[PDB]
Amino acid sequence: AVDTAEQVYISSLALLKMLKHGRAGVPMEVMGLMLGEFVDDYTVRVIDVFAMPQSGTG
Amino acid sequence: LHKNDIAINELMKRYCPNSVLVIIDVKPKDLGLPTEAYISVEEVHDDGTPTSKTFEHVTSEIGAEEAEEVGVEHLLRDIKDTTSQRITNQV
Amino acid sequence: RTRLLDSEIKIMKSEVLRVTHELQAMKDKIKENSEKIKVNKTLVSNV
Amino acid sequence: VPGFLQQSQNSGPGQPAVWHRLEELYTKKLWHQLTLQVLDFVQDPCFAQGDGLIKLYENFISEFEHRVNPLSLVEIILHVVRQMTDPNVALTFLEKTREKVKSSDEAVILCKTAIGALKLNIGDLQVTKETIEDVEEMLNNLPGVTSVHSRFYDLSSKYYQTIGNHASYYKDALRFLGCVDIKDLPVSEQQERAFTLGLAGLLGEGVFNFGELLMHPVLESLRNTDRQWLIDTLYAFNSGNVERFQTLKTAWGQQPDLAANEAQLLRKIQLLCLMEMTFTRPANHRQLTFEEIAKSAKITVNEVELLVMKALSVGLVKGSIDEVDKRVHMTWVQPRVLDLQQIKGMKDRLEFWCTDVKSMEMLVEHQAHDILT
Amino acid sequence: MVLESTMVCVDNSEYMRNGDFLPTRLQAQQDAVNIVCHSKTRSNPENNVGLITLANDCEVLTTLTPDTGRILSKLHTVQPKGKITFCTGIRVAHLALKHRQGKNHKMRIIAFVGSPVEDNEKDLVKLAKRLKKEKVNVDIINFGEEEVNTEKLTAFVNTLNGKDGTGSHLVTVPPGPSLADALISSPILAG
C-alpha cells in the first residue's frame, strides 16, 4: 500500500550528469540505471548516477 | 601545498604532456576566485640550478562552457540582473 | 649476446603493441561496426 | 690477468694499504668499491702507472663486466692522460668506449664534455661549436648529473675565450656559480677567478644591469680578500656613478682591456645615473634640467641627446626630453636591484597606499553610506 | 596457505650492479621477485603483489594486483641506481595495504636491501614498534651485500612484533664467489 503523497530526494549532481549527457548526446533518447537508496516509503533519495555505454538501445 | 605535489604531477606527466595540479578550495571563504591551476614549469633561477618544478600560477578563470542552468539557475533563487556598483566598489 | 635480453623486451613490447592494436581495432570495432550494421540492418538517398 | 696485478701490485710505500685489498677485490669480483678504487687511485696521488697499465683490463671490464656505468672509464682515460700526454688517441679511444660500453644513464653528455675538456690541445673554434653545442642539445632533458654542467661551464668558458661575447662570461659565470653551489675547492683559486670575474664582466658589455648580483655570497666571500678597490669599483657600477675616485680608479689601476670601451663604461655611468636620478628622488620635477646630467655624468650639452638616444637604443628609460628648455625629461625607468632599507621603509608608500586608499574607500562609501538600500 | 599480503620491494639502488656471483645481481633480485610472485600466483588467486621501489621515491607503477606478468616485465630494466631507503617501503606498503579491496589478507613485507641502508636507530625502533601497534609480520631479507655486524635490519627483526610474531628474521649475505639461486636459496627459507 505505497499509495501516499510521495517524494524524491534528488541529488543536483545527478541532474548535472543528466543534462551533461542528454544535452549533447545523439539526437535520440538516453537511458540508464539509478544509484541512490529506497530510504523510505513516502519519500525516496537519490545521490549518484553513472554515465551509460553507447550501445544501440532506447 | 605539501611536498609530493611535484612528484605526483611528474608521475602523471606521462599521461598528460602538460599535467596540472590544482590547489582546490574546500571552504569558499575567499575574497575572490576559488581554486587555480598550476602546470609543469621550468623556472629554476638566474642561478639556474637543477630545474625545480614547483608549478607556477598557470592562470585561468571560471569557464562556463555551456549554460546548462536549466537547473543551475533554478538553484540560485536569490539574485536578479543587477542593473551593485557599490558592492563592486567596497569589494 | 647481452642485447638478446633487450631484444626480448622489445619483442614483448611489440607483442603487447599488437595486442593493443587488436583491442583498439577489433574490440572497439565490435561496437562501431555493430552500430554501422544496425543502421544498415535495423532500417537510400542522394549525394 | 690476476698475475697482471700480482706484478703491478706494489706501487709505492703504503700504497699496498689499498693494493693488498685490491688483490682481494677482484677475487670478491666486486665493482662498486672497485669503481671507487678507480676513484681512490685518483684520490691517492698516483703518478699514472697503475691505470696506464690496467687500461687493457679496462677494455676487459668492457668485455666481461658489462654492467657498471662508464663514469670511471672516462675518469680512467682522463687519468691515464698523465702517462699519455697526448689526447689524439684518447679521443678515438673515448668515443670507442662510448659506443662499446652501455648504460641506461645520460652518457653522451659526459662523453662530449670530456671531449670538450681535453679539446684544449686542438686549436679551438673549429670543433668546439659543434660538439659543445651538442652538449646543450642533450642538456634539456634532465641535467641531474650537473658535474656535466660544471664541465659544460669549463668548455663554455674556454668557448668564451674563443672571442666574441665579452659579457657572456657573466651568464656563463652564473652557470659556474650554480654548476655546484658549494664551491668544492679552496678559496684562493676561485677568488682570483672572482678577481678576473669582476674584470671580464666589467670591461666587456653585453650585459647592461652589471651591478646586480654583487650581493651573492659565494663571490663576495671570495672578494673579501681581493684587492680592496675592485670591490669598490664594482660598487661604483652597482651604486652607479657617485664614487668619483672609483669610476676613475677603473682608469687609475685596472689597465688591461680598459681603454677600448671605458668610454662605454662612462656611457653606462650615465645610463645608470638616469635611473639613479629618477629613482633616488621619488618626487616630481620629472622635466629635469640637463644640469645635473652635464655636471655629474661627465657629459656635455651637445652629448646629452646622444646620452639618452643611446638609452632609447638600450630601452630601460624612454624620456620625452625637452629641447626648448634643454630639459632632460624623466619618464618610466628600470629602477634598481635591491634597496633592503627601502624594502623595509616602503611602508611610507605601501601602508600609505593600503590605509589611505582604504580610508578614502571608506569615505566614498561613508558619504554614499545610506544608499546601501 | 597462510593469509597475508606479502609485499616485495625491488632493490633498485646503486649497489645491485656488480658481477660478483653471476655477472649481475639483477638476476638475484629479479628471480627472487619471480619466485615470490609465482608463489603468490600458485598460492591463492586473491592476493595483491605488484611492486614497490626504494630508489628516491615510492613509485607504485602498476596496481597491487593478482596477476604478475606486467610487473615481471617491469623487473626488466629495474634501474638499480638510486638512494636505498628501508623506511619508506614499509610505510608506503602499510598505507597501500590499508588500500586493499578483498579484506582476506594480513600484512607481510619482504624488503630487498643490498646496502648499509640509511635509517636511524630511532627510526628503526619507531618503525618496528609501529608495526607492533599495527599488527604486521615482516620477512627481512638482505641481497647484494650488507656491511658486517649489521645494525638496521637486524634490530628491526629484534623489535618488530610480538603477540603472534614469528616473521621477523634476517639472513646476512656475504659478497663471495657463489651463485644467484644460492643467494635467493639462502633467503628463500627464512625471509
Side-chain angles (χ1 to χ4, degrees), chain B residues 38-43 45-46 48-52 54 59:
Chain B
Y38 313 84
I39 217 75
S40 187
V41 293
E42 292 71 20
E43 293 177 350
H45 211 275
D46 289 345
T49 41
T51 298
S52 176
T54 309
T59 59

Side-chain angles (χ1 to χ4, degrees), chain D residues 19 34 41 141 202 246 258 288 290 369:
Chain D
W19 285 85
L34 184 42
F41 289 157
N141 196 1
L202 188 71
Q246 295 295 320
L258 175 71
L288 286 178
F290 63 96
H369 194 273

Side-chain angles (χ1 to χ4, degrees), chain D residues 315-320 322-343 345-348 350-356 358-361:
Chain D
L316 60 89
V317 60
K318 295 178 294 298
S320 68
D322 188 357
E323 290 167 344
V324 64
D325 301 333
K326 299 186 286 185
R327 290 176 180 270
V328 180
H329 181 79
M330 298 297 108
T331 63
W332 176 73
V333 81
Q334 189 68 253
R336 292 299 181 193
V337 174
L338 172 60
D339 287 326
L340 192 146
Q341 64 178 357
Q342 288 184 355
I343 294 300
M346 55 86 224
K347 289 172 90 287
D348 292 330
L350 193 74
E351 189 270 333
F352 180 80
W353 179 263
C354 182
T355 197
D356 288 330
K358 183 182 186 296
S359 66
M360 293 181 185
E361 182 70 33

Side-chain angles (χ1 to χ4, degrees), chain D residues 4 45 48 77 114 135 143 145 181 186 207 236 253 267 271 277 353:
Chain D
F4 186 77
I77 185 61
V135 178
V145 176
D181 280 330
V207 68
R267 174 65 189 86
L271 178 66
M277 70 181 78
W353 179 263

